[PDB]
Coordinates of C-alpha atoms and ligand atoms in Angstrom, one line a residue:
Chain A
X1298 CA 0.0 0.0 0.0
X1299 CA 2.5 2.7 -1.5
X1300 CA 5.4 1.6 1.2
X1301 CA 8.7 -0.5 -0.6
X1302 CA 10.4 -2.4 2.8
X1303 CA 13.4 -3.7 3.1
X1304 CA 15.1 -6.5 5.5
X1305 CA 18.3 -7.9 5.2
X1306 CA 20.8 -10.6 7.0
X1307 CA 24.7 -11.4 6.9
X1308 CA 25.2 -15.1 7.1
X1309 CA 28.7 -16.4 7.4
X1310 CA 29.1 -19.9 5.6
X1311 CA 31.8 -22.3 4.9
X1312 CA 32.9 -24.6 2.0
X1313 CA 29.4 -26.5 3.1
X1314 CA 28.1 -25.6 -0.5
X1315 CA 25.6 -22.9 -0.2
X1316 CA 22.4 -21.3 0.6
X1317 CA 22.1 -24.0 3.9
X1318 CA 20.1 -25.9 5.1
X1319 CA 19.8 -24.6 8.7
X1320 CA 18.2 -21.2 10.2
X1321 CA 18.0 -17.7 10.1
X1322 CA 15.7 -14.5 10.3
X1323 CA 16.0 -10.5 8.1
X1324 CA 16.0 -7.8 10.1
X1325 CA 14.5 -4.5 9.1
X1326 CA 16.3 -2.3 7.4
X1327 CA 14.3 0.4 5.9
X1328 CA 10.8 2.1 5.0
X1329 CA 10.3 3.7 1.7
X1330 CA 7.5 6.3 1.3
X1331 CA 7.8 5.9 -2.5
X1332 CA 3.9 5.5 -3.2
X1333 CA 4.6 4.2 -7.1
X1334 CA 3.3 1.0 -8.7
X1335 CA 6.4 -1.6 -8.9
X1336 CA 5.7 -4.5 -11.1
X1337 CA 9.2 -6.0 -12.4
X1338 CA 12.6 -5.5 -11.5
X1339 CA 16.2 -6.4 -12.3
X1340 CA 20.2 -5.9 -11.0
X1341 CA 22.7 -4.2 -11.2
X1342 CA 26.7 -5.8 -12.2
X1343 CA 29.2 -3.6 -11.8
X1344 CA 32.1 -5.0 -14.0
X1345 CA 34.9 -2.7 -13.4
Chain B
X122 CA 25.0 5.3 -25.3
X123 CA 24.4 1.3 -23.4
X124 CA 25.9 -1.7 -24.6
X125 CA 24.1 -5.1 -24.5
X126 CA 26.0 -7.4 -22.0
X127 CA 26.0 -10.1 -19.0
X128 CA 23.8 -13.0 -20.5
X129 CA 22.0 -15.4 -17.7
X130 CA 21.9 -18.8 -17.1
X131 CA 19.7 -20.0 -14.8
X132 CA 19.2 -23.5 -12.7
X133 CA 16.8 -24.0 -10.3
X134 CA 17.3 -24.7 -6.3
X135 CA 15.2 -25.6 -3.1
X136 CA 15.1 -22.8 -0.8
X137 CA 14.8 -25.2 2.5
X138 CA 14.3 -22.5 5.0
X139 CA 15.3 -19.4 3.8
X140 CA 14.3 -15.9 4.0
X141 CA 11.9 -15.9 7.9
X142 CA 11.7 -12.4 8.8
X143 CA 10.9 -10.8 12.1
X144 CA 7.6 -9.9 10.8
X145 CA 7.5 -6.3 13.3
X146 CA 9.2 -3.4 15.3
X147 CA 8.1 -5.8 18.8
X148 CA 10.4 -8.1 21.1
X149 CA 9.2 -11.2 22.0
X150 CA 11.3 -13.6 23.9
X151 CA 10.2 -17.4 24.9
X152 CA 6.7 -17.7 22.8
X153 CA 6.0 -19.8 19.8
X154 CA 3.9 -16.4 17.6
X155 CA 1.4 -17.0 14.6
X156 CA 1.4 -14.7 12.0
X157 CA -0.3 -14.0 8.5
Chain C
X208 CA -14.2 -5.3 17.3
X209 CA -12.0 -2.5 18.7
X210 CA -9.0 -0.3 17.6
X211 CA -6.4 -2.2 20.1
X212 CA -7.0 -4.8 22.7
X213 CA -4.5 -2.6 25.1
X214 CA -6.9 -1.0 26.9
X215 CA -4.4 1.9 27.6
X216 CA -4.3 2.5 23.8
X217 CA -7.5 3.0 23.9
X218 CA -7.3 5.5 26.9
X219 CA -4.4 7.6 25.5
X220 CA -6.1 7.8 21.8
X221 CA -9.3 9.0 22.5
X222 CA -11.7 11.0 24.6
X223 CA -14.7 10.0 26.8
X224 CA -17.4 10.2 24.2
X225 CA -15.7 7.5 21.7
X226 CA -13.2 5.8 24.1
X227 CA -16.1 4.4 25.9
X228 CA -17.7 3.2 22.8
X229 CA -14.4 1.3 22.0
X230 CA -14.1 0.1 25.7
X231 CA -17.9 -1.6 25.8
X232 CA -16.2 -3.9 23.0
X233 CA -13.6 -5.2 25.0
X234 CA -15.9 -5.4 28.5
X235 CA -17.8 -6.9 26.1
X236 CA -15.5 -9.9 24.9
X237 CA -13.9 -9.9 28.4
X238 CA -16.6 -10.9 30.2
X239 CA -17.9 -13.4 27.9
X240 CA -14.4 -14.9 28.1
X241 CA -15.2 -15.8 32.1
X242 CA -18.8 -16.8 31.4
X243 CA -17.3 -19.4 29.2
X244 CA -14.3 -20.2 31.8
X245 CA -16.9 -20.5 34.8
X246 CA -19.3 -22.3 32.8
X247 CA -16.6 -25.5 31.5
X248 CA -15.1 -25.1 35.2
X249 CA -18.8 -25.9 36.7
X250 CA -18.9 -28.6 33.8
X251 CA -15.7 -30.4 34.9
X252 CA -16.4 -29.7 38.9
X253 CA -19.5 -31.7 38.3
X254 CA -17.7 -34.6 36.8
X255 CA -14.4 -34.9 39.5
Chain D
X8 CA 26.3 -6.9 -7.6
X9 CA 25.5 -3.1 -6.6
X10 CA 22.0 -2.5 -6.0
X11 CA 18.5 -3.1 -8.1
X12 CA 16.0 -1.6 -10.4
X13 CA 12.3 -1.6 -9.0
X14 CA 9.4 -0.5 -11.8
X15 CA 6.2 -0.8 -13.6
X16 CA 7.2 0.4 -17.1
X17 CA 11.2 1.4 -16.5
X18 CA 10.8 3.9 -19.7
X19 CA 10.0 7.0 -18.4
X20 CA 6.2 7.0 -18.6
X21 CA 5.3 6.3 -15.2
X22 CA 7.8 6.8 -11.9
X23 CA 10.4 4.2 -11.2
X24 CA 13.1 3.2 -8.8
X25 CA 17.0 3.1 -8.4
X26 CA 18.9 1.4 -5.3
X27 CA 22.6 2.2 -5.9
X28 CA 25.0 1.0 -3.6
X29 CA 28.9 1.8 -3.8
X30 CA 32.4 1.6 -1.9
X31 CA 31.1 4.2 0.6
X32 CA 27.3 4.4 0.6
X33 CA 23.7 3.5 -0.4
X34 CA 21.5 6.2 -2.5
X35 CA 17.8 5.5 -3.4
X36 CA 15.7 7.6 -5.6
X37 CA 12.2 7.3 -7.3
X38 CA 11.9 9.1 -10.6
X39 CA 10.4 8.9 -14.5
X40 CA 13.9 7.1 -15.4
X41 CA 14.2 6.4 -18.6
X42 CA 16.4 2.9 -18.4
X43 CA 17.9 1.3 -21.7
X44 CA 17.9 -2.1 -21.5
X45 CA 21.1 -3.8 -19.7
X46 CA 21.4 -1.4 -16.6
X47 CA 25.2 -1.8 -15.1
X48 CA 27.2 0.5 -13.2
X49 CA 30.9 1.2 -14.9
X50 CA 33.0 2.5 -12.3
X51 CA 36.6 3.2 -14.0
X52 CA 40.1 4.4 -12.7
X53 CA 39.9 7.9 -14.0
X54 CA 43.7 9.3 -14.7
X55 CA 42.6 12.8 -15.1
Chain E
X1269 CA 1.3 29.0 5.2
X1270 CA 3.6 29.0 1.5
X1271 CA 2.9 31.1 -1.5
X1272 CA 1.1 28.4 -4.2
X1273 CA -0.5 24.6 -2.7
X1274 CA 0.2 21.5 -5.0
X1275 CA -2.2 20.3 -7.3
X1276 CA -4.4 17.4 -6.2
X1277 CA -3.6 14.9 -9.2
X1278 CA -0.2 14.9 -7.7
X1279 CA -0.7 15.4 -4.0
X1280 CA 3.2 16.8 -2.3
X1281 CA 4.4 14.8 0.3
X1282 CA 6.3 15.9 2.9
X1283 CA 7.8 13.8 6.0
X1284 CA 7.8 15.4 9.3
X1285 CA 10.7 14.0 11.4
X1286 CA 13.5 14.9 14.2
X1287 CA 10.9 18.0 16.0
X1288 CA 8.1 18.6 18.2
X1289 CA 4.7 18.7 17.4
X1290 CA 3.7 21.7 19.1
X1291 CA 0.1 22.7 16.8
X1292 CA -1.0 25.5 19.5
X1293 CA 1.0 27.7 17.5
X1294 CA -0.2 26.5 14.5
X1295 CA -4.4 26.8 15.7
X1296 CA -3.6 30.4 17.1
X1297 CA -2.2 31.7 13.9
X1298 CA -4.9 30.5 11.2
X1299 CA -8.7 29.4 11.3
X1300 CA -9.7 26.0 9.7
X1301 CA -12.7 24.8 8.6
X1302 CA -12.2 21.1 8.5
X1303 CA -10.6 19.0 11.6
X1304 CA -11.9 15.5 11.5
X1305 CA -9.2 13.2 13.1
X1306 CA -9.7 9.4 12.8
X1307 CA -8.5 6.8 15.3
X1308 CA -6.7 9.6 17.8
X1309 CA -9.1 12.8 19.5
X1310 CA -7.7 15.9 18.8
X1311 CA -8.1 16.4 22.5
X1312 CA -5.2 14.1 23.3
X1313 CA -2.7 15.6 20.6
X1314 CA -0.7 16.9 23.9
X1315 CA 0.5 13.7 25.6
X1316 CA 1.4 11.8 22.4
X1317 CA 3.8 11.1 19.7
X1318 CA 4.7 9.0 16.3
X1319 CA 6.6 7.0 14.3
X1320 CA 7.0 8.5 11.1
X1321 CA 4.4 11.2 10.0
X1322 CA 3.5 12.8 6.6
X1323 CA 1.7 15.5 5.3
X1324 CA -0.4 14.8 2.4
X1325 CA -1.0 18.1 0.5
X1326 CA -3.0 19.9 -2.1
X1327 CA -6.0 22.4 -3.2
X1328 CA -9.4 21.0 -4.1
X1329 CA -12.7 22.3 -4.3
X1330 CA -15.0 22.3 -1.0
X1331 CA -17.3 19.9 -2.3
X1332 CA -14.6 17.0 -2.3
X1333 CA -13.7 17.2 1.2
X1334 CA -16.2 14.8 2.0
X1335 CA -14.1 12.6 -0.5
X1336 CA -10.9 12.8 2.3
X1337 CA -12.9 10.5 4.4
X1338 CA -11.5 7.0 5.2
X1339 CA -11.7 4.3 2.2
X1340 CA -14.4 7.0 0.7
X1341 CA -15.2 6.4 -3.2
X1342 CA -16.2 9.5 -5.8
X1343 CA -13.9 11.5 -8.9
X1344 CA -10.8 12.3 -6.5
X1345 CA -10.3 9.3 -4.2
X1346 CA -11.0 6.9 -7.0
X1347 CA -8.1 8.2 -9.3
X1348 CA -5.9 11.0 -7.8
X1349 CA -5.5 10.4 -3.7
X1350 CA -7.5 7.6 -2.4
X1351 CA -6.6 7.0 1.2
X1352 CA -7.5 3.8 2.9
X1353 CA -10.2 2.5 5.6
X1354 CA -7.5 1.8 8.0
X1355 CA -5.9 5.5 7.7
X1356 CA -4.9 6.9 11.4
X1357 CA -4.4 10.4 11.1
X1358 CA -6.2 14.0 11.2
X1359 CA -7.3 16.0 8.1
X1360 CA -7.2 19.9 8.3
X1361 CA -8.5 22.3 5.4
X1362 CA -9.5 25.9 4.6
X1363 CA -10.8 28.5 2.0
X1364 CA -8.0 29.8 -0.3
X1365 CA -9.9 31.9 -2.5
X1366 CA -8.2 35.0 -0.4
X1367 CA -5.1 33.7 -1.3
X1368 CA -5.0 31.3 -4.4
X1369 CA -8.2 32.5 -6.4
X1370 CA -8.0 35.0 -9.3
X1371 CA -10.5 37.7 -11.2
X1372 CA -9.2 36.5 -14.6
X1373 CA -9.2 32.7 -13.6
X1374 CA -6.6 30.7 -12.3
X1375 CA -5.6 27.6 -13.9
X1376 CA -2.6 25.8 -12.5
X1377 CA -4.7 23.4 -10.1
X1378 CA -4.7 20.6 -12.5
X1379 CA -7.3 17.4 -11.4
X1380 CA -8.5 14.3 -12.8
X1381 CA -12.0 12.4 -13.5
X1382 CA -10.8 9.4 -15.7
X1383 CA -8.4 6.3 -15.3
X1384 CA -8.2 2.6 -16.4
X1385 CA -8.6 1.9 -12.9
X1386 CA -8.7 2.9 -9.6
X1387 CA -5.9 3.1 -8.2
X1388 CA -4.2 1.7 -5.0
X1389 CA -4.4 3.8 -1.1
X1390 CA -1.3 6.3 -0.8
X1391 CA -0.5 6.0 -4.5
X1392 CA -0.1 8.9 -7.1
X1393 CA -0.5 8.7 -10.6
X1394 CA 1.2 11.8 -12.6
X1395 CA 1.5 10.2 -16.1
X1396 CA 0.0 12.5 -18.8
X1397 CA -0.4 9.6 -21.3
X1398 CA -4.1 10.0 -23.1
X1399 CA -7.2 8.1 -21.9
X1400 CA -9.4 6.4 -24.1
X1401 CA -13.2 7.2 -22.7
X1402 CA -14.3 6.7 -26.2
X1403 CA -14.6 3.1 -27.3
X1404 CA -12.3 3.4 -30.0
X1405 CA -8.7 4.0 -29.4
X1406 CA -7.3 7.4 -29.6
X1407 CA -3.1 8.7 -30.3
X1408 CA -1.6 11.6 -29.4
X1409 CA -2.7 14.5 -27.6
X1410 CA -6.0 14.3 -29.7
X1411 CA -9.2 11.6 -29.6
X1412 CA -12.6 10.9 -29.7
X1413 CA -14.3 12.0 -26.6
X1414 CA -10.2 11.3 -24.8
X1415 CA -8.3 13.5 -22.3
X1416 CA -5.9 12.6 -19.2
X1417 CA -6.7 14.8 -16.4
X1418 CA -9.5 17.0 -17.0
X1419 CA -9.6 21.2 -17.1
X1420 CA -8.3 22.9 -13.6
X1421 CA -11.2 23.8 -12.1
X1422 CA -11.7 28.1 -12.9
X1423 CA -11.3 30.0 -9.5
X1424 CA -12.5 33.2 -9.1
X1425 CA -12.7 35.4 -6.0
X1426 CA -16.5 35.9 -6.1
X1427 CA -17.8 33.0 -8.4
X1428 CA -17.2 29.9 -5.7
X1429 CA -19.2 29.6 -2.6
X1430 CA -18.9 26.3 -0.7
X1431 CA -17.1 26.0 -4.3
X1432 CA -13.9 28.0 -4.1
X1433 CA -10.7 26.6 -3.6
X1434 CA -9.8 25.1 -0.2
X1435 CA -6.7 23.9 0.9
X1436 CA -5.6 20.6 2.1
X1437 CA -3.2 19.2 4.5
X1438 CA -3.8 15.4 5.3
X1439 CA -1.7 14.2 8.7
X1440 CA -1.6 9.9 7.7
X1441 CA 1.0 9.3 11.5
X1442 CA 1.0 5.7 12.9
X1443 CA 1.7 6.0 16.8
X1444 CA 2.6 3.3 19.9
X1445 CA 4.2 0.9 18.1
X1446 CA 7.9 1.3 16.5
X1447 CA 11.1 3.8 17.6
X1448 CA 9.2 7.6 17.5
X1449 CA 10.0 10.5 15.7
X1450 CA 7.8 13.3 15.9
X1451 CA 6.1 14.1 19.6
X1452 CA 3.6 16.1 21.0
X1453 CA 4.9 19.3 23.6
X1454 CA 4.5 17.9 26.7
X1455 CA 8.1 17.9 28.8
X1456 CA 9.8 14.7 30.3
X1457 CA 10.7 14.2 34.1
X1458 CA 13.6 12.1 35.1
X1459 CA 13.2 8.6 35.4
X1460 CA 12.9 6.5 39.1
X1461 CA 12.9 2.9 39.9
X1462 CA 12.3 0.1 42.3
X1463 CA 8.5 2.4 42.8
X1464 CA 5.0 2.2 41.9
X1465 CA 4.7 5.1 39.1
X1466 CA 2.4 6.4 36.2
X1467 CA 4.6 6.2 33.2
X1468 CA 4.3 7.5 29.5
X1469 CA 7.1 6.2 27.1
X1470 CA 6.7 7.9 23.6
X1471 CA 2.8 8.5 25.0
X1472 CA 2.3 5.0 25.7
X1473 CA 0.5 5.5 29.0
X1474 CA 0.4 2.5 32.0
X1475 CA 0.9 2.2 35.5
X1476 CA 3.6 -0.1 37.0
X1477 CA 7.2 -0.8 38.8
X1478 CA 10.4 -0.1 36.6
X1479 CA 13.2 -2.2 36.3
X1480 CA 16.5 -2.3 34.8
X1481 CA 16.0 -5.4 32.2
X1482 CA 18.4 -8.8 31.4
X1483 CA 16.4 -8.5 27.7
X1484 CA 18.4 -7.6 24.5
X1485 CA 16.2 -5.7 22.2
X1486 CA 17.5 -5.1 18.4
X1487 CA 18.2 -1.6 17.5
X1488 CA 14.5 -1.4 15.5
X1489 CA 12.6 -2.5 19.0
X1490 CA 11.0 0.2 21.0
X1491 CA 8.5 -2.1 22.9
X1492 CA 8.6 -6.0 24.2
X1493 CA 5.4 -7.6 24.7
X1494 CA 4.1 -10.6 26.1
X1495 CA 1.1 -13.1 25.7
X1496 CA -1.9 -10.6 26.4
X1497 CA 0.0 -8.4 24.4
X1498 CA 0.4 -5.6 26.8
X1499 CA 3.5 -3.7 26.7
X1500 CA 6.0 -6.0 28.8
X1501 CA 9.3 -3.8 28.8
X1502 CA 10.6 -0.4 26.9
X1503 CA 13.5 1.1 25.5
X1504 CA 14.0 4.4 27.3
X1505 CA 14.1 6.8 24.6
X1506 CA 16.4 9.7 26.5
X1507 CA 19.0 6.9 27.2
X1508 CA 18.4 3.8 24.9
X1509 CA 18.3 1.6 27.9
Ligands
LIG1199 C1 29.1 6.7 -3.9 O1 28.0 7.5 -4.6 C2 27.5 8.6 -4.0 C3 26.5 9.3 -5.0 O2 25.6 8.3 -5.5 C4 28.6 9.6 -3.6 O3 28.0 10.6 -2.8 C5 28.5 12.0 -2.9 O4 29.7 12.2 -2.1 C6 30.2 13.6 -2.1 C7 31.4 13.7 -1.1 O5 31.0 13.3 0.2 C8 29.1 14.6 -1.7 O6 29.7 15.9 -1.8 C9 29.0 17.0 -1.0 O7 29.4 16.8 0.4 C10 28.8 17.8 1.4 C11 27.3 17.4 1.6 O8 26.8 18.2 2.7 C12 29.0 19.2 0.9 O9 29.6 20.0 1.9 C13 30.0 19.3 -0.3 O10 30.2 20.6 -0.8 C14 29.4 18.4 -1.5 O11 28.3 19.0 -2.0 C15 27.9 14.4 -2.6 O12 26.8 15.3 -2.2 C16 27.4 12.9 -2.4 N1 26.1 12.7 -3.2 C17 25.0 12.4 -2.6 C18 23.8 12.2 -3.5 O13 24.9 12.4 -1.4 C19 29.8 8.9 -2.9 O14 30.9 9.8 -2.7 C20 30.3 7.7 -3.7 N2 31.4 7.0 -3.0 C21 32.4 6.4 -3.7 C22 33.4 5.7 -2.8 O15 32.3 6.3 -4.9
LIG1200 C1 0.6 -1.5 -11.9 O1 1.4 -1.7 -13.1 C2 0.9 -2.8 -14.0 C3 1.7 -2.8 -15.3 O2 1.4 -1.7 -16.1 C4 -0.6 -2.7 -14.2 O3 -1.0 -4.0 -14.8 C5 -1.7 -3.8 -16.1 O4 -3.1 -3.3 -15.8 C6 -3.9 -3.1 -17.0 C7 -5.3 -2.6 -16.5 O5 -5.8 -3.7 -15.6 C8 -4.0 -4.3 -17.9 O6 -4.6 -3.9 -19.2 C9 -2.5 -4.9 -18.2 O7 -2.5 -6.0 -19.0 C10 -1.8 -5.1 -16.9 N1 -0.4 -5.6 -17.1 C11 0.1 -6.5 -16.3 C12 1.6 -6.9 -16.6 O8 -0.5 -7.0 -15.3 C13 -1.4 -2.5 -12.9 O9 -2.8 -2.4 -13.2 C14 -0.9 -1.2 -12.2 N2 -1.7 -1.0 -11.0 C15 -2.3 0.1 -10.8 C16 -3.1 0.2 -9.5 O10 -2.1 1.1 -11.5
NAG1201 C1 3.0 33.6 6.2 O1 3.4 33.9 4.9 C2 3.3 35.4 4.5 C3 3.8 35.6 3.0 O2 2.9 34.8 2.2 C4 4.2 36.2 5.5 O3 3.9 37.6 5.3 C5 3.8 35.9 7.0 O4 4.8 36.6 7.9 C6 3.9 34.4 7.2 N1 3.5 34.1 8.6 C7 4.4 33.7 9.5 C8 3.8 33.2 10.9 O5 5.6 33.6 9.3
NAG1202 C1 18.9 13.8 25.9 O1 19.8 14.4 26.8 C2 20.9 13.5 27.3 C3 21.7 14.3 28.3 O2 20.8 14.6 29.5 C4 21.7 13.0 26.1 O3 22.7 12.0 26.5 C5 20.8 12.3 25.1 O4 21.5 12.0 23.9 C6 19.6 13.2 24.7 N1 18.6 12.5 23.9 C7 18.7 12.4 22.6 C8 17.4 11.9 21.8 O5 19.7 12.8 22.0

């Protein structure tokens, strides 16, 4: 309803492959007031 | 000017437990919470 | 049926004329809460 | 990986979104971008 | 109180953070006509404070204030600044006409009537693109009974009357739940302990013993709760603890 939130989490992993099994939770990391229609998206490389 | 680059390749994987967010600006300590 | 179950938020928020009208909810549910408690605790004090 | 793109049209028609995130800090802005097609960031060693 | 209001098919937005919310100063130095709060009396404005506040804002005629109602359907809240049912906040509004209105008509209040659909609560829609009202499609700035938004509505000094231009200001806060930002003028004490006191923490009222807590709230928390939901422990906002 016009808000975009974000929440977010660090996780360190080891040589375990990836994206694991186990357990965690995002905190909040900010309200946006933005009040536009999002419908797609997409991200941003930065080759150097 | 843009220049067409950085071509995809997906797969697909099982997100097993991923991505549980603490769902407000509240603490709560010792309590099993339902939430929609 | 109310605007918050904290019956303080209620009492902070607004004045007499609508707080009370809010309120009556909550006595309301309350108190149907302990009919329902006193009536199954007859209902099992009849049984031990 | 630098930040997202967040829209409903991404061509300038309606409002659209930019996360950028760099060495330093985070900025976010909501505006009729115009976006070409592969959005990437080309940060450079500039001599001058 | 600035020169020229925003136009209502897209409503400014400003956030109010990082002050005090003293509106005595505000009530004393211009008349109103409208003041309809909803979910908070403007009675308790004093002892009370929130989380992050804006300020909807725009001209409109008088007629469509009744439209600034809660989840309220008709021309403006349909397509240009629908506002939902569940909207806490206060609206405020007043007669421009002594200020905004002109003899030779003015015309920069620009307003819509037609849209492919209405739109979302809190969402703005400032695309010119043409609307096709006619069946057939239409191209351009031209078409077949087409426009975008419609005319600005002519004011005049003399000409409206309950039909003049009014200005709007729309206060959407949310309060009592999350780290506060903006608070009403009332002054803090110190804090005690160990004793039987009537607290307010960011206006959330209670009586109760204070204690300093074992708990290890994250940096977002302002309240911790328990199973009746009533406010278990607080982040002392003068000190963080
Ligand atoms: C990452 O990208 C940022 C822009 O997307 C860029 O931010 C810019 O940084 C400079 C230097 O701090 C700021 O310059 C201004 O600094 C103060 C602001 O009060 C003024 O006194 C100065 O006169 C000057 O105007 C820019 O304003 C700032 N831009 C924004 C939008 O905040 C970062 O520097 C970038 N970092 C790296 C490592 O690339
Ligand atoms: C948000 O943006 C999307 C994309 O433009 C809108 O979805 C379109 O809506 C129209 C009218 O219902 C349809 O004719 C299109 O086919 C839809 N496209 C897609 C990809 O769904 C959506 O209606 C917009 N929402 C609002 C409230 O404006
Ligand atoms: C309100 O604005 C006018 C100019 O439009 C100015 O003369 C007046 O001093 C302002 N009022 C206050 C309280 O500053
Ligand atoms: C309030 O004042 C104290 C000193 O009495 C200070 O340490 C504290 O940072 C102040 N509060 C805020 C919100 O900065």
């Amino acid at each position: 309803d016009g808000y975009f939130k974000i929440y977010s989490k660090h996780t360190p992993i080891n040589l375990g492959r990836d994206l694991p099994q186990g357990f965690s939770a995002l905190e909040p990391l900010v309200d946006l007031p933005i009040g536009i229609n999002i419908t797609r998206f997409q991200t941003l490389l930065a080759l150097h | 000017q843009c220049v067409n680059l950085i071509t995809r390749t997906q797969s697909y994987t099982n997100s097993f437990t991923r991505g549980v967010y603490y769902p407000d600006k509240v603490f709560r300590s010792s309590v099993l919470h339902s939430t929609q | 049926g109310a605007i918050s179950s904290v019956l303080n938020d209620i009492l902070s928020r607004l004045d007499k004329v609508e707080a009370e009208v809010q309120i009556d909810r909550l006595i309301t549910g309350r108190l149907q809460s302990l009919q329902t408690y006193v009536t199954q605790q007859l209902i099992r004090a009849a049984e031990i | 990986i630098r930040g997202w793109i967040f829209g409903t049209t991404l061509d300038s028609k309606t409002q659209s979104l930019l996360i950028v995130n760099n060495a330093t800090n985070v900025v976010i802005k909501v505006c009729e971008f115009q976006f070409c097609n592969d959005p990437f960031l080309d940060v450079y060693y500039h001599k001058n | 109180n600035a020169t020229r209001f925003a136009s209502v098919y897209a409503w400014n937005r400003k956030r109010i953070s990082n002050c005090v919310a003293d509106y005595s100063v505000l009530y004393n130095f211009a008349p109103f006509f409208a003041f309809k709060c909803y979910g908070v009396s403007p009675t308790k404005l004093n002892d009370l404070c929130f989380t992050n506040v804006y300020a909807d804002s725009f001209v409109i005629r008088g007629n469509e204030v009744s439209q600034i109602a809660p989840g309220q359907t008709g021309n403006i809240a349909d397509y240009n600044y629908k506002l939902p049912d569940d909207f806490t906040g206060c609206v405020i509004a007043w007669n421009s006409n002594k200020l905004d209105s002109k003899v030779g008509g003015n015309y920069n209040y620009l307003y819509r009537l037609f849209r492919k659909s209405n739109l979302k609560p809190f969402e703005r829609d400032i695309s010119t693109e043409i609307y096709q009202a006619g069946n057939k499609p239409c191209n351009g700035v031209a078409g077949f009974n087409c426009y975008f938004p419609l005319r600005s509505y002519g004011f005049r000094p003399t000409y409206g009357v309950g039909h003049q231009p009014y200005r709007v200001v729309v206060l959407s806060f949310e309060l009592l739940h999350a780290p506060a930002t903006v608070c009403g003028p009332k002054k803090s004490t110190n804090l005690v302990k160990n004793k039987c006191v009537n607290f307010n923490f960011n206006g959330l009222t209670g009586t109760g013993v204070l204690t300093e807590s074992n708990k290890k709230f994250l940096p977002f928390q302002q309240f911790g709760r328990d199973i009746a939901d009533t406010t278990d422990a607080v982040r002392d906002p003068q000190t963080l603890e």
